[PDB]
From Swiss-Prot, chain A:
Part of the 30S ribosomal subunit. Interacts with proteins S7 and S18. Binds to IF-3. Interacts with VmlR. Interacts with BrxC. GO terms for biological process: translation. Located on the platform of the 30S subunit, it bridges several disparate RNA helices of the 16S rRNA. Forms part of the Shine-Dalgarno cleft in the 70S ribosome. GO terms for cellular component: cytosolic small ribosomal subunit. One of its GO terms (molecular function) is rRNA binding. Keywords: Ribonucleoprotein, Ribosomal protein, RNA-binding, rRNA-binding. This is Small ribosomal subunit protein uS11. Belongs to the universal ribosomal protein uS11 family.
Curated annotation (Swiss-Prot), chain B:
The gene is rpsG. Belongs to the universal ribosomal protein uS7 family. This is Small ribosomal subunit protein uS7. PANTHER family: RIBOSOMAL PROTEIN S7. The keyword rRNA-binding applies. GO terms for cellular component: cytosolic small ribosomal subunit; ribosome. NCBIfam families: rpsG_bact. InterPro entries: Ribosomal_uS7, Ribosomal_uS7_bac/org-type, Ribosomal_uS7_CS, Ribosomal_uS7_dom, Ribosomal_uS7_dom_sf. Keywords: Ribonucleoprotein, Ribosomal protein, RNA-binding, rRNA-binding, tRNA-binding. It comes from the Bacteria. It holds the Pfam family Ribosomal_S7. Part of the 30S ribosomal subunit. Contacts proteins S9 and S11. Interacts with VmlR. Transmembrane segments: none annotated.
Swiss-Prot record, chain C:
InterPro entries: CSD, CSD2, NA-bd_OB-fold, RNase_B_OB_dom, RNase_II/R, RNase_II/R_CS, RNase_II/RNase_R, RNase_R. The gene is rnr. Pfam families: CSD2, OB_RNB, RNB, S1. This is Ribonuclease R. It comes from Bacillus subtilis (strain 168). PROSITE patterns: RIBONUCLEASE_II, S1. GO terms for biological process: mRNA catabolic process.
Swiss-Prot record, chain D:
Coiled coil: none annotated. It comes from the Bacteria. The keyword Lipid biosynthesis does not apply. Keywords: Ribonucleoprotein, Ribosomal protein, RNA-binding, rRNA-binding. The chain holds residues 14 to 77 of 79 of the full protein. Binds as a heterodimer with protein bS6 to the central domain of the 16S rRNA, where it helps stabilize the platform of the 30S subunit. Part of the 30S ribosomal subunit. Forms a tight heterodimer with protein bS6. The keyword RNA-binding applies. The gene is rpsR. This is Small ribosomal subunit protein bS18. Induction: Strongly expressed during exponential growth, decreases 2-4-fold in stationary phase, part of the rpsF-ssbA-rpsR operon. The operon is induced by DNA damage by mitomycin C. Transmembrane segments: none annotated.
Amino acid sequence: NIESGIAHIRSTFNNTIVTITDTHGNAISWSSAGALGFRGSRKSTPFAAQMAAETAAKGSIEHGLKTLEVTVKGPGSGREAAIRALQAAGLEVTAIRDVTP
Amino acid sequence: KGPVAKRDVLPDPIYNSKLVSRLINKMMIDGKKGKSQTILYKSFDIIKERTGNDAMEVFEQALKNIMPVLEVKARRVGGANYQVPVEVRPERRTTLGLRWLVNYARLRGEKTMEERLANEILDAANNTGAAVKKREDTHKMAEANKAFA
Amino acid sequence: KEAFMEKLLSFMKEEAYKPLTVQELEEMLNITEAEEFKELVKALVALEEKGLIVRTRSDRYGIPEKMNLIKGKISAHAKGFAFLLPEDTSLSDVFIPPNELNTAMNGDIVMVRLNSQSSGSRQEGTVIRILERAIQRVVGTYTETRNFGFVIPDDKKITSDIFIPKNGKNGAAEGHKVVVKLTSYPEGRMNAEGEVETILGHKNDPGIDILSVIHKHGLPGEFPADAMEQASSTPDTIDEKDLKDRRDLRDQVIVTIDGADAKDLDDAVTVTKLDDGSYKLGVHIADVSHYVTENSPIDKEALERGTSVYLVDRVIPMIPHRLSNGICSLNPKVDRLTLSCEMTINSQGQVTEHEIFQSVIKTTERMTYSDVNKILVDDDEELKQKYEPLVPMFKDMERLAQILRDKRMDRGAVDFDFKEAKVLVDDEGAVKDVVIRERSVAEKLIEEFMLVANETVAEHFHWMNVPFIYRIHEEPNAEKLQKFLEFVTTFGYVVKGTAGNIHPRALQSILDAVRDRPEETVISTVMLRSMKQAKYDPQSLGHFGLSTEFYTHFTSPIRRYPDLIVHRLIRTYLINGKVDEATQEKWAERLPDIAEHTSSMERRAVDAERETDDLKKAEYMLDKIGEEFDGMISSVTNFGMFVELPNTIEGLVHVSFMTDDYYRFDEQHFAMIGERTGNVFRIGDEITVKVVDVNKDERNIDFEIVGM
Amino acid sequence: KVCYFTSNGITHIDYKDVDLLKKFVSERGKILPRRVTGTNAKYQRKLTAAIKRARQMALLPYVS
RNA sequence: GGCGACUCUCUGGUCUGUAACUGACGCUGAGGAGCGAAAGCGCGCCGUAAACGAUGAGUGCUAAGUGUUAGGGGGUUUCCGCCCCUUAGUGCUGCAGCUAACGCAUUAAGCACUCCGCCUGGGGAGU
RNA sequence: AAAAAAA
């Protein structure tokens, strides 16, 4: 049971993972386009991004999260939708970060 | 490059119908327009004696039922083999109307052509026979592969 | 899966079902389980694979059958193909091909069907039927063909001509412009038939370009004989009987502040600073409802017109020029029958006291916005000496306007500042100059007063709970806003709101942050593309852009019919005291039709004003050929690039003129991406361009990439 | 497009003035180019040292 | 050749202005010494090098136009701003002249003087 | 392609 946390979205060209953690980086929950049953083209899409983002977000709200810091990696098209999806799930987003090298 | 103009046929002198003339020219063999002018005027007297209606009332009704609305056209882009439903241009409707009317009239069992042409018109007018069927046939086929176009 | 897939299909098959997103589905159907949420998705995969539910591009789900008959408005292209705008605009553009449009015209309502193929990114529509005919009439040049006639439509959006028979020639020769009352329409291969209505005049005439647009849009025109009779009978001076029951305000310092070319002076203004630090604001509005009485000839015409329209070269007024510029006008130094709103406003901008009453004022002076700025901002002594009695009032006006603005921004109002422009033409209609319409302090002063007046009137009648007309602005479209909120996340911003329920303040908080940055024009432009339009309505639904729940238009009855209605409702409810049930039921019946009509007439007017602006904008630049300009990339469509010159003139730059490389539109990051040379053309970038093709007739201007 | 530092008679930019420097970074933290802030090259260089000195002592953030 | 996070320490050169001083103390520089890539190879040697803006150094002279970097002088103007002049650097365009042509053109490949390096058909052979 | 508001 924790309130504040980070959401590490990895949107690649092939897949969207979404982990959510605490401030110490311990995984609270996660979901992904592949674990959403999307396959091939669909895993790349921003539809599958929001699906995974919300699937893990709603998993985090069970543990009782409210505020998320986001961190993004990878060049995929999913970050845009996924981050809105964290706001649309209910969780308020503060600091955005794009940690893409 | 620019659609060639179709040859302007004269009206049929007794029914004043360029449709009826076009039938004559469709029926004409080896440039014997005389034989075909006789046959039709013999066939339309047969229609008027049986029905009592004007031959023009029946013949136009016959064409309505033979005349196609949609046709199958072969399209083979890459694979495709698509039987593209194509709307029959109003000139090609009459074309296929008169072609089928004559083509199936010649194939009928009756002894003389004047009777054969009369009976095919009478059958066409009653929404039956073979020439009406042929329109249905291609529409049934056009409905079958209607998912292309 | 099978169970839910059927249960979902059964729910979607209900007649009341509308398109629902993944989240919205499991709300009416109701799902709360984490493992049932894991069950939903592979089910959506299956139903969409089997062709049982189709995904609308807005990520809403509906059976192929539900969408099948989209019944959108025809968005036809000038070349001869088309796209579509479905009933719910959430659905994307469905492609209607030249071959299968089947007698559909740009703007008609249809029932296009889907194709089981697509040779591109777009869904393939097909006009299997026309649910409704639109384009009732077209304007155009008449042309003689093969011993026949054929009016060619003004716009190229109709790709065919209109068959003119000789009985509908009626003047139209090779040259003459004419409207066509289409007496028949296309038929497979055949064209539309018609007649000749108004012989506008030879097509190549100066002032036909306007007159052609005057009839194209279906704008108003010349006052009917009964309206002109009533206008002629209206007194040029106030009768002593009309001064009865009106508060005398003539001996007070009351003035008008308008543009230099304004003859239709609606509003008067006085401000007195009180000893407690509050201000007393006297807003006085021309009493048009006195002259233009209910069910009069001018009233029926004013309803028909709906608003004044301000074309580049002329004004088409809502009420006759004799009234609008004469007795109704608050001309300087005369008695004026005016409905007033007198407001005491505290240091936080809150209206503590207010009174609405009938009155008569003596316009001490007619001021310009330019003069008032020079007094207040430039501190100009010469204009101060000239208007010495007004100078103390202008200082109190400046402070109150600041207080009202500070309230309005703190309430959360969204203040964009897209540079509007005023095309300057002579009396012959030649475009001598074009310049930016600078809203400085004096304009922003009058704006705030009219706003608080309008809010106060609207608030009063909300609490009176009587039938009344409001000026509403809905919350922005949740799909367009969703794309905007994504777009502003490219830059690292976070907006404290959802696409369903965003607070106006949140959208202002972006506009403030981006001020003076490379993400300023881009964001602002995508925020507009997510904004809607404002309209009149009998229900108090609130004004999103002004962030207030109570708004109406009271302060311009010469030029807006809803303001003349408010004036009559004020006279009905407050002055005459008629708040009986029969009076309410009568107005409750009449207001919805007036509101919907007047809102349609406003949109028609604005479209026409813009059309003439864009027209004379080309006319101005029919000599700019070659001349290079440093103008910013205002828009990046896939078919080219759009560059606004500083003076608000935009022009096109296709890949045809992107000669160096084969560029590509990145939608997510609103930009042009070239690859062969490795180039980048984002929006808002300051660049150079050259005028190549100002085609005035279609209102085109073209540029070429001189550079960045 | 004017140099803020010349315009306002400023000769020395100070890595301690956090809100002064804040006008010359993006929200992520990226130093905004001369072409967009209109700074003079002389000052752009003074500015950039200051921003980096700021970043070291956690007055400003690092990029994205 | 090169040299890009920040700070401190130590340290080299250049530019502008004033002329207080010295009073030709200057230029070039075989040889020599030192610096000096992936080399090549055990921090050491090696040290050849599209180590080719394909252009030696120094000096003076010979149209212009325009941009940028670091200074100076002046002008109005409150500084700013905007204009004018100027020094040093770095670009683009362009005369005269030069060039086989291409081009170069006050950052010369022009017009001159001093000193150095270097070339004298292609292979064979950088053997 | 084009928001308030004003003209």
